[PDB]
């Protein structure tokens, strides 16, 4: 279990702060948080090169991120919105190679 | 004695398009602290490594501190000291497996003699000017007669992240920011509180300013933070 996503299913309320953790067991430097949408393949919301670091990806609006340790990299919705209702994937990266987790569906009522 | 700077001297956060959470990370309840320690090892000429194990999470058991030049590191190599500074992990290297490791600059003060006798801590006043009008003052506290500028700098910005949202994840309320120390002897130096322009922030490099291991007589040194805003 190279990447662990929690909770795999979440039901939030509009305008509520929401946090979706990710644990990696290989200690890779880089971690990524995407969100899967039909026709959208997988877009990158925020990534990180290390404990402390956190970088905007292609669609970072509405979200924050946090690298407390080498293992944990989390995504945060400051104020959840119906628009943010999707399925979320984080990966950990070794180099030119990615390792994904099982995924996290979120509903924002 | 570096002279007060002017607008074309200072960083504009609006010129920064990266993640200000990377600035924030370094001054939001974030610091390596250790009381009474001796160098255990070494990597380059100008560095010193300690066994300081991560207080909060479990992110490091060894701490490398880089100083300005070799003799500076020898100065302290075999001294029972006190550590305290802002630490970073991206681009922190030091081949001594199992990492469990962090880096920082300067931040080393001699142990014995340097503490205030009984309980008692020394309170240092910080005046904050926002667009010139001194709109708030406060004090940071230490326990060393001779405290690194670093140390009071970190506490100052930590208080301000909180009380004035000095730093945020995305940006900052202020366009400019710098923190001036003025010493009894009349000496003064100021640090830019903002990251260089661009869509990236090098944490290793920003902190490198603490190389000098500059120290200041807590009891009499003063502190001025000058903050500027634009759009209001």
From Swiss-Prot, chain B:
Zn(2+) binds at residues 8, 82, 111, 115. It comes from the Bacteria. GO terms for cellular component: extracellular region. The keyword Secreted applies. Keywords: Disulfide bond, Enterotoxin, Metal-binding, Secreted, Signal, Superantigen, Toxin, Virulence, Zinc. Its main location: secreted. It holds the Pfam family Stap_Strp_tox_C. Interacts with MHC class II molecules composed of alpha/HLA-DRA and beta/HLA-DRB1 chains. Interacts with host T-cell receptor/TCR beta variable chain TRBV8-2. Belongs to the staphylococcal/streptococcal toxin family. Staphylococcal enterotoxin that activates the host immune system by binding as unprocessed molecules to major histocompatibility (MHC) complex class II and T-cell receptor (TCR) molecules. In turn, this ternary complex activates a large number of T-lymphocytes initiating a systemic release of pro-inflammatory cytokines. Also causes the intoxication staphylococcal food poisoning syndrome. This is Enterotoxin type C-3. The gene is entC3.
């Amino acid at each position: 279990a190279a990447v662990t996503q929690s909770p795999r299913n979440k039901v939030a309320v509009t305008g509520e702060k929401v946090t979706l953790s990710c644990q990696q067991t290989n200690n890779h430097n880089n971690m990524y948080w995407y969100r899967q949408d039909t026709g959208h393949g997988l877009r990158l919301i925020h990534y990180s090169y290390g404990a402390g670091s956190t970088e905007k990806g292609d669609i970072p609006d509405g979200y924050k991120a946090s690298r407390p340790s080498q293992e944990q990299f989390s995504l945060i919705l400051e104020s959840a919105t119906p628009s943010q209702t999707s399925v979320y994937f984080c990966a950990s990266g070794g180099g030119g190679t990615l390792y994904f987790g099982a995924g996290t569906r979120l509903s924002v009522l | 004695s570096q002279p007060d700077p002017m607008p074309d001297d200072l960083h504009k956060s609006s010129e920064f398009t990266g993640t200000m959470g990377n600035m924030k990370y370094l001054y939001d309840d974030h610091y390596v602290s250790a009381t009474k320690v001796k160098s255990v090892d070494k990597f380059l000429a100008h560095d010193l490594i300690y066994n300081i194990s991560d207080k909060k999470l479990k992110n490091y058991d060894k701490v490398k501190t880089e100083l300005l030049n070799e003799d500076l590191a020898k100065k302290y190599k075999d001294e029972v000291v006190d550590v305290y500074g802002s630490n970073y992990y991206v681009n922190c290297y030091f081949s001594s497996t199992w990492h469990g490791k962090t880096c920082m600059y300067g931040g080393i003060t001699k142990h014995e003699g340097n503490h205030f006798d009984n309980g008692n801590l020394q309170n240092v006043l910080v005046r904050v000017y926002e667009n010139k009008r001194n709109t708030i003052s406060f004090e940071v506290q230490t326990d060393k007669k001779s405290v690194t500028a670093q140390e009071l700098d970190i506490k100052a910005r930590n208080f301000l992240i909180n009380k004035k949202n000095l730093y945020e994840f995305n940006s900052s309320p202020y366009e400019t920011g710098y923190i001036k120390f003025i010493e009894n002897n009349g000496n003064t130096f100021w640090y830019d509180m903002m990251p260089a322009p661009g869509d990236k922030f090098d944490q290793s490099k920003y902190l490198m300013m603490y190389n000098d291991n500059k120290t200041v007589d807590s009891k009499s040194v003063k502190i001025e933070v000058h903050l500027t805003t634009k759009n209001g």
